[PDB]
From Swiss-Prot:
GO biological process terms, semicolon-separated: cell wall macromolecule catabolic process; defense response to bacterium; peptidoglycan catabolic process; viral release from host cell by cytolysis
Enzyme class: hydrolase
Top-level taxonomy: Viruses, Duplodnaviria, Heunggongvirae, Uroviricota, Caudoviricetes
Native organism: Enterobacteria phage T4
Gene: E
Transmembrane segments: none
Protein name per the record: Endolysin
């Protein structure tokens, strides 16, 4: 297991524009196209992302390319984030994957809400962190996925992903 296989499980792979769990146009392996309700706006974003006229459809190679860019951008974002970087750098490799997964899904706008979870993670208070992480819109809206990510943070093993 690695971050790619982990996010591939959590995000799936769809080659046609679909709506994510939040109702937003997405393609590939959880590549968010736009929060606009306008399918045409999503199609424009897709064509810009791929560099061709996709008419709402991409190849597996194209999805994996976007995924590579997206995973890279997630980690680089974490490393640029003054609140996230020290927590992330405190973690072992498996827990770092959980951090990448969480940011991939959630972005960074809600980092301040997770101040207490982040402190507990940096402190390596794993069960406490896991209890705190679950007290979230995140957990309640995507519980099965959040349970996996949280188990990963709690144990630093890949048990939740088999």
């Amino acid at each position: 297991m690695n971050i790619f296989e982990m996010l591939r499980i959590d995000e799936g792979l769809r080659l046609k524009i679909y709506k994510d769990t939040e109702g937003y146009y997405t393609i590939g392996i959880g590549h968010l196209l736009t929060k606009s309700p306008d399918l045409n706006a999503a199609k424009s974003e897709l064509d810009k992302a791929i560099g061709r006229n996709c008419n709402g459809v991409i190849t597996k190679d194209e999805a994996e390319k976007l995924f590579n860019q997206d995973v890279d951008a997630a980690v680089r974002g974490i490393l640029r984030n003054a609140k996230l970087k020290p927590v992330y750098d405190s973690l072992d490799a498996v827990r770092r994957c959980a951090a990448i997964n969480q940011v991939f899904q959630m972005g960074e706008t809600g980092v301040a809400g997770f101040t207490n979870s982040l402190r507990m993670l940096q402190q390596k208070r794993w069960d406490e962190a896991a209890v705190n992480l679950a007290k979230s819109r995140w957990y309640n809206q995507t519980p099965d996925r959040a349970k996996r990510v949280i188990t990963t943070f709690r144990t630093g093993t890949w048990d939740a992903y088999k």
